[PDB]
C-alpha cells in the first residue's frame, strides 16, 4: 500500500476529502487532478459572466471558523476567479498542494480482491496503490461539440465555454451562441454589449428570473459575519441550503392580489431558488401552481422585451417551471438594435459553413466567432470515462449500462472502498453543503474502519435497491421529471445516512 486513500478532484468535494482524511485522521493520502492548480469546475470555466447560483456568504466551507470571519463578500453573488482565489487561499492555508499530484488524469482504477485495495493508474502509466478510493470527479460537460454538419470548415474563432481561452476580444465582430440554458444566460448578457451583432440560437426558451447581484456594504458583510453560527444552523436544517425561508403557503390559498405581491417580492429581491421555493411551497408539486409561477414570467418578460413577437419567442412553451435559472439582465437584452433571436426549434441550423451558419430556411448567418454554450452532462459520464472495475473486474460502464445507482449516493455495490462525493442519486440542494456533508460521513466511516481493523467496505445490492425506491417514492411526487435523484432536501439526507451511521452502518458489508 502506497497510501491509506488516493483522491480524484482538486475541486470542492477532493480539497476537503484531503483535509479531513489527512489532518483530522492521520491518514497518508494523495490526491489527483488533470488540472494545473486547485478548484476543480472553478478552475476549467472561465467564460463571460460566470457566476454562482447560490450567494457568497453560503458558497463556501463552513468547517473553518477563522476562515468565515477573514472571507471577502465583495458582492451578493461570487464570480468564477473570485470562487477560484478562494479555494486557493484553502489550499495555502491547510498546506494541501504538497499531496496533491496536477497535471495527472487517472486512466484506470481497478480493484485488488487478494489484498483489499485500489490499483490506480495514471495516464502516464504510473501506478499507486492505496486501500480507499475517493471520486470526487464533478460533471463533464453536456455536448462535446454540436453535432452539425461542416463544423469543422468554420474558419472564424470557434470557443466553447467549457474551455474558454485567454484575451478572447469582442469589439467590431459579428458572434453567435448556441444554448439558452443557464451557461448561455450568462454570456449572452455578459457579451451583448461589447459586440457588434449577437445572433442567439435558441432551441428551447427557459423561465429566468432576475439575480439580483448587487454590492456589500461593510455593515451588510458584518451582518452576516456576526451570525454565521445560526446561518449555517440553518442550512443544515433546511431543504435547499440557499439560506432562503422555504416557505409551506399552499400557491392556491391566496388571492391573485396576494399572489401577485408575494412573486413580486421575490422577483425584487432575485434568485432562482427563492422564487420557486420561498414564495409558496407547492411549486414543483401541483400542475395548478406551477401554471401560476409561469404566467407571472411570462408577463413580466412581455413587459421587459417591447417587440411582442421576439417576446413571443422568448416566451416558454407549455414548459413547466423546473430547474431555476437567474440572469443580471438576460431579457432586456433583446431589446437592443445589435441583437437578433433566431427559434433554431422552428427553423434548425443545417450547415455551418467557412464565415457562417446556415439554417432551414436558406438564410447565411455571418460570423467572426461561434460560442458552444456546452451545458453540462448527466455524470453518471464523468465515471464512464474512468476504467473503473471493482469485483471480478465488472466495469462501471458494465454496471450502470441502464443508469446509475447507488447507496446513499455515495457507495456502489461490487465497487468496495470507493466512495463517491458529489456523486449520482445525491440530494438536490447548495453544493458545498452537501459535499461537507458527505465527506465527513465517509471519513467517519473510514475511521470506524481503522478502529476495528477492517478492510473491505461495500453495499450490498439490497441496500441499493432500497436507495433506489427511497428516491423514486420522492421524486414521483413531483413535477420533476414528467428518478435518479434524492428529492428529500438535506436535512432528511442528513438523517438517512445518520441512521445508517448509528446502525452500525446498516446495509453494508465490513469485513475482517
Ligand atoms: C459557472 C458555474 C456555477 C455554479 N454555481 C453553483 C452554485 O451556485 N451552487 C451549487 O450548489 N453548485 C454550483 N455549480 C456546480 C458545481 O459543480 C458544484 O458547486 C461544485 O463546484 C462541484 O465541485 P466538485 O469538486 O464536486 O466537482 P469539480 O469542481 O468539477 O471537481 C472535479 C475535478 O476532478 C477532476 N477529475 C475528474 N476526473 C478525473 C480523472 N479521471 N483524472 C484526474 N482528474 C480528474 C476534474 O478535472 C475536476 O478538476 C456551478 C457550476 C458552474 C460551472
Redesign the pocket.
Known amino acids: 500500500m502506497d497510501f491509506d486513500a488516493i483522491i480524484?478532484?482538486?475541486?470542492?468535494?477532493?480539497?476537503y476529502s484531503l483535509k479531513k482524511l489527512r489532518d483530522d485522521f492521520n491518514l497518508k493520502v494523495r490526491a489527483?487532478?488533470?488540472?494545473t492548480e486547485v478548484?476543480?469546475?472553478?478552475?476549467?470555466?472561465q467564460?463571460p459572466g460566470?457566476?454562482?447560483?447560490?450567494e457568497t456568504h453560503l458558497?463556501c466551507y463552513s468547517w473553518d471558523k477563522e476562515l468565515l470571519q477573514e472571507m471577502e463578500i465583495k458582492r451578493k453573488?461570487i464570480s468564477?476567479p473570485d470562487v477560484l482565489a478562494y479555494l486557493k487561499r484553502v489550499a495555502d492555508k491547510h498546506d494541501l498542494r504538497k499531496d496533491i499530484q496536477f497535471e495527472?488524469?487517472?486512466?484506470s482504477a481497478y480493484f485488488d480482491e487478494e489484498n483489499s485495495f485500489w490499483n490506480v493508474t495514471t495516464?502516464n502509466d504510473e501506478k499507486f496503490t492505496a486501500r480507499f478510493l475517493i471520486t470526487?470527479?464533478?460533471?463533464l460537460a453536456a455536448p462535446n461539440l454540436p453535432k452539425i454538419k461542416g463544423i469543422e470548415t468554420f474558419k472564424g474563432e470557434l470557443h466553447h465555454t467549457s474551455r474558454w481561452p485567454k484575451d478572447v476580444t469582442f469589439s467590431g465582430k459579428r458572434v453567435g451562441v448556441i444554448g439558452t440554458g443557464?451557461?448561455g444566460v450568462?454570456v449572452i448578457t455578459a457579451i451583448a454589449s461589447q459586440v457588434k451583432h449577437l445572433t442567439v440560437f435558441q432551441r428551447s426558451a427557459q423561465y429566468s428570473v432576475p439575480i439580483g447581484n448587487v454590492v456589500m456594504s461593510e455593515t451588510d458583510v458584518a451582518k452576516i459575519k456576526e451570525n454565521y453560527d445560526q446561518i449555517w444552523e440553518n442550512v443544515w436544517n433546511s431543504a435547499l441550503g440557499y439560506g432562503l425561508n422555504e416557505s409551506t403557503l399552499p400557491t392556491m390559498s391566496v388571492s391573485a392580489e396576494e399572489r401577485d405581491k408575494i412573486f413580486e417580492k421575490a422577483w425584487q429581491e432575485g434568485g432562482g431558488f427563492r422564487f420557486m421555493f420561498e414564495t409558496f411551497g407547492d411549486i414543483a408539486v401541483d400542475e395548478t401552481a406551477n401554471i401560476e409561477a409561469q404566467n407571472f414570467i411570462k408577463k413580466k418578460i412581455s413587459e421587459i422585451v417591447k417587440d411582442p413577437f421576439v417576446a413571443k419567442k422568448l416566451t416558454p412553451t407549455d414548459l413547466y417551471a423546473c430547474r431555476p435559472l437567474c440572469d443580471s439582465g438576460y431579457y432586456e437584452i433583446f431589446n437592443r438594435d445589435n441583437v437578433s433571436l433566431e427559434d433554431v426549434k422552428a427553423n434548425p441550423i443545417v450547415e455551418i459553413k467557412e464565415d457562417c451558419v446556415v439554417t432551414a430556411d436558406g438564410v447565411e448567418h455571418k460570423l467572426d466567432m461561434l460560442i458552444c454554450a456546452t451545458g453540462?452532462d448527466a455524470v453518471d459520464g464523468?465515471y464512464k470515462?474512468?476504467d473503473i472495475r471493482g469485483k471480478d473486474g465488472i466495469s462501471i460502464k458494465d454496471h450502470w449500462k441502464d443508469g446509475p445507482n447507488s447507496y446513499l449516493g455515495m457507495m456502489v455495490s461490487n465497487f468496495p472502498n470507493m466512495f463517491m462525493?458529489?456523486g449520482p442519486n445525491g440530494p438536490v440542494?447548495?453544493?458545498?453543503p452537501?459535499?461537507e456533508t458527505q465527506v465527513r460521513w465517509i471519513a467517519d466511516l473510514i475511521g470506524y474502519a481503522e478502529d476495528h481493523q477492517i478492510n473491505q467496505i461495500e453495499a450490498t445490492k439490497d441496500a441499493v435497491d432500497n436507495w433506489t425506491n427511497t428516491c423514486s417514492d420522492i421524486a414521483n411526487k413531483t413535477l420533476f421529471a414528467k428518478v435518479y435523484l434524492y428529492m428529500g432536501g438535506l436535512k432528511e439526507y442528513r438523517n438517512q445516512i445518520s441512521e445508517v451511521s448509528n446502525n452500525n452502518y446498516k446495509g453494508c458489508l465490513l469485513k475482517q
Request: proline fraction near 2%; aromatic fraction near 20%; glycine fraction near 16%.
Open positions: 480524484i478532484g482538486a475541486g470542492f468535494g477532493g480539497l489527483f487532478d488533470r488540472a478548484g476543480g469546475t472553478w478552475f476549467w470555466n467564460y460566470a457566476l454562482s447560483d447560490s458558497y453573488y468564477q495527472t488524469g487517472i486512466r495516464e470526487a470527479l464533478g460533471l443557464s451557461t450568462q453540462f464523468s470515462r474512468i462525493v458529489f440542494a447548495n453544493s458545498p452537501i459535499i
